[model samples]
Structure formats: structure tokens, C-alpha cells
Target: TTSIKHAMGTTEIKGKPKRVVTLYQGATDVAVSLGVKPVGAVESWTQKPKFEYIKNDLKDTKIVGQEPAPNLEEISKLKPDLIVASKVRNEKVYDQLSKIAPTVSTDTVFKFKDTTKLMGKALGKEKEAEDLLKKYDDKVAAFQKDAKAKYKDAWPLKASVVNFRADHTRIYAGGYAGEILNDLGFKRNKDLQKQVDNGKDIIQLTSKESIPLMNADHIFVVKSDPNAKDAALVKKTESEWTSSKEWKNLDAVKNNQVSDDLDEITWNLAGGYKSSLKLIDDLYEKLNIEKQ
Candidate 1:
């Protein structure tokens, strides 16, 4: 028997779990990273049923429902031996999930490393998880060295992860992408750094008047999928924001350092180990940093 303790509680497994169901994006992603394609998984934030990167891997997996509100009936139908979930997304349904199977959960969904560690124990693949994280850390260290070599004294350039929505623009202060960029030694915009220091995850701009806050040496925009209905609004919103004098005066725009082609799934939505590696790949390509 194996005992796994998580943010929700402790779960005991009689043996290694073979049939696993994942209840959030990160869990589903971490499962795949550990070479365990979940028997069932929740729907993605974009790309409908699953993200494009993992579609082939989960081709036969049952869709339990959306992330925030997975269908209990559908999940139970899978008869999973183990279930992985997120506290923030499934706190209300933790008991229900526990009744369905031995369940382990992390505090939140966006912290990929924490999910990896927790799921590693539950999946009985601690070594695999450790190796995955080590690879990410090694990549980060190399990127840091290469970036410093490339930029010299200007090594840590102020950068921001920007996203456009129907009614607002977001300057990500600390989420999956924001956190990874911080780890790679990119300096956050001073004001955004202050907000992160104050416990804010995003600086939401509802009014274009606040455009100046997005000023940075580099801006990585998280583009919405073209098929999404929100893409229309994102286009309109970006058009409006970019045409403004304040936005034009921003360092990234003036210097042509704004990158609009980052894969939204890896950069912002799919919070998992594999996605982290892909995000690093994007950074190297976009920043022209030599990968060591």
C-alpha cells in the first residue's frame, strides 16, 4: 500500500494505480508527461476537448467535462483506480471525487512543478518527475547564461506577458508564463513586479488609458486560438490598444520587440511540465538566445 498526502487530504492506494482520471488541465498534462495517458480528462480552456499538443496522446481518453465543472457521472463511468485534481478548481467536489476513487490534489492548478511532484508520488514515478524538473532547471540555467552573454549588463531586460480579452487587457504578473519567465532571469516591469510582490497575479486593464503600464523592453503576447469566438474581440481589442499613442510609445512596440506568435497553450494555458519545456523553446526562438 502507498500513502499520498496532498492539499485536500491523504489517500492510500493498495498498489500502483493503472487507471487514472485527471480533473484539471495541469493534472491531465502532468499525467501525460509521466507517460500515463489518463483514462479520462476534463475539457481544455482552448482547443475544445484537448490542447493540440496533447491531442494524439489522449485520442482515446473520455471527456469528463470542462475544468471548472467536470461531470461526476461521466467520471464515475470510467471506474478509475486513482483520480488527480486541483484544490482551487475542485474543492467543492473533492469528497465526490474521493468517493469515486483514491484522489490526490494540489493547492492550485497553475503551479506545474507542484502538480508534477504530487502526481509523481501518486503515479509512482518520482524519478521521472525529478528528471523532468531537473531538465527544466538545467534549461533555465543555460538560458540564463546565454541571455547574460547576449545582453551583457542589460541581461535582465524588463519583460511582460500580455493578453487581450473582449473587455480587458491583462499584464500577467505571476501565472505559469510569468513565473517561468521570472525563473529564466527576465526582469519584470517595475510596476508589475510591485504587484507580484504585493500578491497580485494579473494587472487587468479595462480602460485603454492604462496602456502605459504595459511598457517593457520585451512583450510576449498570448494569442487566442483563431477558432475561438474570443479571437474576434482579441483582434478588436489589440487593434484599439496598439493604435493608442500610449501603447505606441511603449518600449517593446517602438523597438519592435513585441512577440505575437507564442503558442497560447504552452505559454499561458497548459500548466504542466511538458508545456514548460515548450515555453522555453518558444523563448529561445523568439529571443534568439542560443540554446546550450
Candidate 2:
């Protein structure tokens, strides 16, 4: 028995709930991390229930629809007593979702910790969320120490989030991935930081520009997208772009500070607890910082 005060005001969650329908990707990720079996969830466009890494927890989970537009009819069929959503994404459908069940929403989607904290209250798992956060913090602490000790002279590191679509590239200055990188003590370059502070989500670049605006110490390129599945094509385009004289002239390229080793979804796209942990692992591996 609990009442959650969220973006949509207060709503009582009576007793523990097993039948939950998640309307947002981060919500789904938090629900699964909390050990709750969401009866219904909206997955990515290409990945059905979940992507490869997080699919194990979605057994017997019904797909309501895509992430942006959940199938209300299907969600209704699930008869979930609890519905998790984000205010920024599904404000228009909150009323309808509330009509079906107790719907809880967060103000934003990319703040993974805040969304998880809200879900903990909504699902009667507040302590669980706290513990999860503590674990996350401890991991960050350990990694920060390890990175500082092992890397030696890599302070004030900056990273750029990029995605190639065979033609153009999107540089995400602010997002879940950027947030996690910042937590790891990575700084954003002045240009990227200016855009982020100004609330710019991404900066677009065309192939004609060639080099793009990557003045950061490192470049973390996303080789895959949840909305699309063409790794081979992306690799080919990436190969062609990187081989160009223009791309080769970038500061990061000249210093060999570019890597695609991070998980495309965990580090760049749907960065929830599971994905965030995976991202930490990727970071540790890249920096040769052993995890404690």
C-alpha cells in the first residue's frame, strides 16, 4: 500500500503490483531492474519486447506497441493495474492510461535515476530503488578512483555522442549517455557544453561537411540504433567517413581517441541500469581500469 507523488500528481498504489505496463523505454528498464515483471511494455521499433542484452527479463511480456505510440487497445487487454509512463512523451495519453489503471509518469525520460526512483515508489519498491542507486553510486566511485589512478593524465576528458545514418550524422550533446559519461568525470567540450546548456539535444552534420564539430578529447560513436537495424551499412558508411581526409584530420582521430566499443543501446540509446552498468564495463575496458 503506497501513494506516489509524480509528474501527474498523487496516485495510490494499493499493495504490490505484478501487472505493470511501461509506456517508456527507461520505465521498462527500471521496472525490470526492480525485479517486477511488466505484463505489457512498449519496446523499440525494431526490437520487439527488448533488445538482446535486456530481453531475458521480458519473458511472457506482451508488446503494447512502439515506444512513442503504445497500443492503448493492447494495454487495455493486459488489464494492468499499474501503468508507467513519462510526462514528456505521453502527456496526451495520460488521461486515457489513467482510465485503464493507476498511471505514474516522470517529468522527463532521459534522467534514468529519477525515473527509477519514481517507479520504486509506484511499485512499492522504494528501498529497492535506493539500494540500486547506492550500488550505482558505489560503482561510480570505484570507477572514478580506478580511472584517476590508472589513466594518470586523462583528466577533463570530453566525449561526443554521434550516430551515422549512411548519409548524415547526429551529435547528441545531451542525453542519457552524455549524463553517464559526465558522471564518470568526462567533460563536454565548450561547443558541446554550450549546446547542452542551451537545451539542444543534438547537432546535425552532413557528409559534405566531412569533419563535423568534434573538438572533444574523445568520440564515442553509436554504430547502431534501436529504431533501425543495419550494422553492416553503418559500418560501411563509418569506414568510408573515417577514411576520408577530412575525418582523419579531426583532433580525436589524430590522437586515436575514437572508439565504438560502447554498447549502442546501453551507452547511447536506452541507458537504464542494465545498460548503464554495461557502459561502465565498456569504459573500464577501454581505459584499462579494472573494476573492483
What would the TM-score be for candidate 1 when compared with the true structure? 0.94
Range of the 10 consecutive residues with the lowest summed lDDT in candidate 2 = 223-232
Model 1 worst lDDT run, 10 consecutive residues: 222-231
The candidate that wins on lDDT is 1
Candidate 2 is scored at a TM of 0.89
Q: For residue 4, what is the lDDT in candidate 2? A: 81
Q: Of the candidates shown, which would achieve the greatest TM-score relative to the real structure?
A: 1
Candidate 1, 1-292: lDDT as tens digits: 8998899988898788989999888889999999999999998888778888898999899999988789999999999999998888899999999999999999888889999999899889999999989998998898889888888988789998888777678887688888898899888777777889998886788888888777789999875533345558877888898889988898999999999867778887888888898888888899888764
Per residue, candidate 2 scores C-alpha lDDT tens digits across 37-93 of 789988753455577766788888998988778889999999899999888878999
Q: Which regions of candidate 2 deviate over 4 angstroms? A: 206-212, 228-233, 236-240
- In angstroms, the error of model 2 at 43 is 2.3
lDDT (Cα, 0-100) at 91 in candidate 1: 95
- Candidate 1 Cα outliers beyond 4 Å, as residue runs: 225-230
